[PDB]
Amino acid sequence: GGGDFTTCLETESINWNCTGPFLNLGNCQKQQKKEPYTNIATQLKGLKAISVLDVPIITGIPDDIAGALRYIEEKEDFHVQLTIEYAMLSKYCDYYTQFSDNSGYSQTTWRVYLRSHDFEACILYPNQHFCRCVKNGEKCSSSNWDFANEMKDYYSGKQTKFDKDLNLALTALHHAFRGTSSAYIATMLSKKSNDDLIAYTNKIKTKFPGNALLKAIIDYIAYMKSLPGMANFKYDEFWDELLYKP
Amino acid sequence: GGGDFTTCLETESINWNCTGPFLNLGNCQKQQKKEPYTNIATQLKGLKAISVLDVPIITGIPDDIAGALRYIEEKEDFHVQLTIEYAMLSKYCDYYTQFSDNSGYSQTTWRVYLRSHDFEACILYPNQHFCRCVKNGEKCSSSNWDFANEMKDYYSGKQTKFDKDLNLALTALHHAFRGTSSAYIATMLSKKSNDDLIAYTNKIKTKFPGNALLKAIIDYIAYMKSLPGMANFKYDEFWDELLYKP
Amino acid sequence: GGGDFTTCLETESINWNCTGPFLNLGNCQKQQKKEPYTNIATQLKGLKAISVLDVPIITGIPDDIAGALRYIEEKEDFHVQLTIEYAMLSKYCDYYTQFSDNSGYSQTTWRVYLRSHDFEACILYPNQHFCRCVKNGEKCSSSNWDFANEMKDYYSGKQTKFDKDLNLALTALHHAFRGTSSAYIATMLSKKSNDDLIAYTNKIKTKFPGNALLKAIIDYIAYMKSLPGMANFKYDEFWDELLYKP
Ligand SMILES: *[C@@H]1O[C@H](CO)[C@@H](O[C@@H]2O[C@H](CO)[C@@H](O[C@@H]3O[C@H](CO[C@H]4O[C@H](CO)[C@@H](O)[C@H](O)[C@@H]4O)[C@@H](O)[C@H](O[C@H]4O[C@H](CO)[C@@H](O)[C@H](O)[C@@H]4O)[C@@H]3O)[C@H](O)[C@H]2NC(C)=O)[C@H](O)[C@H]1NC(C)=O
Ligand SMILES: *[C@@H]1O[C@H](CO)[C@@H](O[C@@H]2O[C@H](CO)[C@@H](O[C@@H]3O[C@H](CO[C@H]4O[C@H](CO)[C@@H](O)[C@H](O)[C@@H]4O)[C@@H](O)[C@H](O[C@H]4O[C@H](CO)[C@@H](O)[C@H](O)[C@@H]4O)[C@@H]3O)[C@H](O)[C@H]2NC(C)=O)[C@H](O)[C@H]1NC(C)=O
Ligand SMILES: *[C@@H]1O[C@H](CO)[C@@H](O[C@@H]2O[C@H](CO)[C@@H](O[C@@H]3O[C@H](CO[C@H]4O[C@H](CO)[C@@H](O)[C@H](O)[C@@H]4O)[C@@H](O)[C@H](O[C@H]4O[C@H](CO)[C@@H](O)[C@H](O)[C@@H]4O)[C@@H]3O)[C@H](O)[C@H]2NC(C)=O)[C@H](O)[C@H]1NC(C)=O
């Protein structure tokens, strides 16, 4: 249920087990988070995972996390982006294990996004368990229950609203899993590979079963994908920028 | 219901149609967001909207949005600040159209602010529809109903509490509409032009009718303005820093 | 109920009255917030609070608050860290008085953190008044009522869950009171000085009685400290990095 870094370097096209949360790391002690990127590049070079030519791209990772994620997602090539992300996860080795529960430094951005904005359907049907889970941290264990089909019926003749709400869920997921995960989601979206997209998000939910809000947003994405609005769904255009170069 | 940039340059004093959200833009395709500020300054110069002397102030806009907004609001002169804001809206051409609905990258800051803090009246009367709309995204369509006059009575003999809660609403609005919009609000506040202030916020609510939380905060500001506490209202002093130089 | 800066410089070990919120300041007018750090270092030097050798560490405080807090907490020595924090509070003289009520620029971070994440106990018992206060700003005046002992019973055989939820409360407090306050909390935690820790947080709650969410999180920390899970409590390891050098 994970991918090795060198094995991932051998593969030609991005796949689920070569995205951030599924990369096999190790420990993760206090010391490694202190390590600067020069040391991590030197480690990767000494193991012959990378060559000298690849050391600068690692040493140019900005020291702050927000800048590091922008730097990673700027890359247009699968193996380069993967190498950078792996260096960063070698410094912040708990970046994605933090997603196992309901808090942590790397979760704040996506949670802040999801809870600060509003779904169109939740504004009209705030008693739905999905909405109560997003807004109040309430009823999360039954979040995937569409009471009286209100949500489904609500979206029925409302392509634009379906598009807004599903894009808000996917934008939250983008903020959760920046970098290779988002390049993979972008790839599937651009090809309308809806079944593969749900397969990947379901793998994320299986990876982090202790993360209640994440489970709710993933179930919601699968629900929207089952609705008639999906056939004409128009994803937000920022995704096209996250695609890799031909 | 909007202002043209050059026409705005001709006018002597800031007015509603020469603030950010009311500046007439066009499209707004994928390409223009990629354009650096040197290109946008060159465009404005080629149209003779600005001269060579004005090119550096545009090319000095920092690349990140937070820095660009700080840069804009640092300006002490109406036409300079307007020109900078217009260059930025020429790059992020959807910055203010994002406010048409209930999400988007440019809305996060103000929504995070409004929902992370608390109104004094809502702590004591959390069942008020305004409070349920701010906190739970619930009852937003009846947010401007003061049940049993609880809010009004609550503020009656409480000048300090009225001041805190109205300032929290206005600070959220400041975070929504930085730059020229905030210089305009600052101008009206410093002159106690309460009717003009409400006229402007009501124009914002009319511009963005699909934005439920924004509608609620704007209705709330008009309600507070109708209360006896408004006559002695003391706005937060940061506003005085956003005024233009004499 | 506060500490003087020079008197604090005389003392050998960090104590409650030499942490940020308890440092005695004065006014705090509009002008002082405009003052750059060179001027503040010159003031402190002219009063002979510091010497010329200490001027650079003050002039190197980055201009943005987030960077200033990172700079302060990087210091490994009590008197240095205190001096830096005092310079910063001399510029943003309302940084900690902002905590007297339910909003303000310096409160956003910790409130955003506390409300974006979730307590394990609140996911299962969302009707608890503590959970309603954190999530909905509701029932804050009775937040410290554990209805039917649900919370206590919930943690009874769940050391890991107790650890997660108490660490989330303490991490929120860390985000509220960065710098010397966090070095003091780190010191008490590393020595399992649970009674002193509660004494300090209770002083914070007494300092800011108008801050409803802060009162709730402080009462909650004292409640957890009373439970059998405290004896084997394992604090998050970032705290050990905030300790001062021997
Ligand atoms: C990320 O995760 C994916 C799965 O999600 C992994 O892909 C699997 O990789 C394994 C190992 O290479 C594959 O198993 C091998 O398949 C060979 C046939 O492949 C073709 O046919 C299958 C359908 O039958 C297609 O799915 C596939 O795309 C090809 O078209 C077999 O010949 C192999 O059998 C031989 O080796 C095994 C193992 O030693 C022996 O037990 C056998 O007896 C035999 O000698 C083998 O079964 C598997 O097919 C792949 N699945 C998919 C869906 O593609 C990636 O490897 C993984 N990446 C990383 C970096 O970890
Ligand atoms: C931003 O939005 C404001 C409104 O909110 C616009 O201001 C209006 O601008 C129009 C066009 O210039 C003004 O209309 C003209 O008013 C002239 C008289 O102005 C004085 O009197 C009025 C009261 O009657 C005052 O409000 C005003 O301040 C002045 O004191 C008329 O003489 C004009 O009539 C002539 O031109 C029109 C149009 O071609 C013809 O149809 C007429 O027959 C006649 O020949 C004209 O009506 C309007 O008064 C302004 N309103 C206000 C409230 O000031 C800004 O122009 C706009 N800015 C930008 C950059 O878009
Ligand atoms: C931060 O806050 C702490 C308290 O939380 C202050 O610590 C107190 O400081 C005062 C003033 O120095 C101390 O009062 C003095 O205590 C002396 C005895 O101290 C020993 O014994 C006590 C127990 O009795 C211990 O707590 C202490 O640690 C020592 O082991 C007395 O001899 C003093 O009395 C003399 O002076 C007073 C005042 O002028 C006269 O009225 C007396 O008659 C007598 O002449 C005095 O009482 C107090 O003990 C300290 N408390 C604690 C708990 O340590 C810090 O000073 C303060 N720091 C800053 C920078 O503000």
Author numbering:
A (entry chain A), B (entry chain A), C (entry chain A): 474 to 719
Can you list sentences taken from the study reporting this PDB entry?
The OBV M segment encodes two glycoproteins, Gn and Gc, derived from a single polyprotein precursor, with Gn encoded upstream of Gc. Compared with other bunyaviruses, OBV Gn is relatively small, with an ectodomain of about 200 amino acids (aa), whereas Gc, with an ectodomain of ca. 900 aa long, is about twice the size of its Gc counterparts from other bunyaviruses. Our structural analysis has revealed that this region is composed of two domains: a 27 -kDa α-helical head domain and a stalk that is divided into two identically folded 19 -kDa tandem β-sandwiches. Furthermore, the head domain is well exposed to the environment and is a major target of the humoral adaptive immune system of the OBV mammalian hosts, indicating that the trigonal pyramid of the spike shields the functionally more critical membrane fusion core machinery from the host’s antibody response.
In addition to the variable region of SBV Gc, we determined the crystal structures of the Gc head domains from BUNV (aa 478–721), LACV (aa 477–722) and OROV (aa 482–702) to resolutions ranging between 2.1 Å and 2.9 Å and refined the resulting atomic models to Rfree values between 0.21 and 0.23. The aa sequence identity among the head domains of all the four viruses is low and ranges from 29% (BUNV:LACV) to 17% (SBV:BUNV). Nevertheless, they share a common tertiary structure with RMSD values between 2.0 Å over 232 Cα atoms (BUNV:LACV) and 3.7 Å over 224 Cα atoms (LACV:SBV). The head domains of BUNV, LACV, and OROV contain each a single asparagine-linked carbohydrate chain and although the positions of the respective glycosylation sites along the aa sequences are not conserved, they project from the same face of the domain carrying the two glycan chains in SBV. Nevertheless, the Gc head domains of BUNV and LACV both formed trimeric assemblies involving the same trimerization contacts in the crystals. The buried surface area at the trimer interface amounts to 1422 Å2 and 1430 Å2 on each protomer for BUNV and LACV, respectively. Whereas the atomic details at these interfaces differ between the two viruses, they comprise mainly hydrophilic residues in the region between helices h7 and h11 at the side opposite to the glycosylated surface. The concurrent observation of two very similar trimeric assemblies in two independent crystal structures strongly suggests that the trimers are physiologically relevant. The dissociation of the trimers at low pH is likely triggered by protonation of residue H590 in BUNV and in LACV, which would lead to electrostatic repulsion with positively charged side chains on the neighboring protomer. The head domain forms low-affinity trimers on the viral envelope that are recapitulated in the crystal contacts for BUNV and LACV.
